[PDB]
Amino acid sequence: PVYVDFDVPADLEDDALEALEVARDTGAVKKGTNETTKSIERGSAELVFVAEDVQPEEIVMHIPELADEKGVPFIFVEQQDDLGHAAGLEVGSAAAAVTDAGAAATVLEEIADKVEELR
Amino acid sequence: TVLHVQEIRDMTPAEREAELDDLKTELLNARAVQAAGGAPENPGRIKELRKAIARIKTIQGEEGD
Amino acid sequence: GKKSKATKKRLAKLDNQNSRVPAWVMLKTDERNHKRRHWRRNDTDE
């Protein structure tokens, strides 16, 4: 909400999650806000996901601007439990980072484009 | 006295209860005789009747009935 | 006044405590009830 400056259409979010699932199987992904933050800082992040139902918002507030000054692309997901399930967790996840996609580097790279265009 | 602990344990759960209800009756009749100013008393027993009843209840508890 | 069952029990007890030390107790102790209470001169509780 305060850290969300653009709305991601339902369909875009699905493509994103889908890509994330093939990422945990084919490539590499980081689950959890602390491990995600470190990707963006270490530059190893290619696409970071951030839930929008995070309370307190403090936990994720920094992702956006941090991602911006690091060139890393990011996309918002409405449900926290969807991101966690997509990432492969039995629990939810406030943030995730596809650390080097897998059999999705295409669809992925394009999701990053659609979002950059989503302003 | 007239009724020892061994003898109570040698009784079956059903014999203790039958013996129990029997002592209560002797007791009740002793109190009746007493309530009627009856002198054919023997104080040592109305007291023994109480202890005997206590023993039986104690044993029923130890044995599990 | 209207007494309850419990009050009635207490007064019954007070009446009972109002008896004298049995004679036999004098002989057994080789020799007074300090809790003697008259209804008029004394006052019970409650």
Partner: protein, 56 residues
């Protein structure tokens, strides 16, 4: 009307009674509070340091 003897005649009202919790004739049946043990007012038992000399 004299405040002494003549005013003593109307005293047939029951207030303090034998308390269920402490046994003292201090349970005020009008207030439903014992002035001796605090029953009706406090779960804890009524007690004060001034009930004895300061150093005792």
């Amino acid at each position: 009307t004299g405040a002494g003897t003549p005013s003593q005649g109307k005293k047939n009202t029951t207030t303090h009674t034998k308390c269920r919790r402490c046994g003292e004739k201090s349970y005020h049946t009008k207030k439903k509070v014992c002035s001796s043990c605090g029953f009706g007012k406090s779960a804890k038992r009524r007690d004060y340091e001034w009930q004895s000399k300061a150093g005792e």
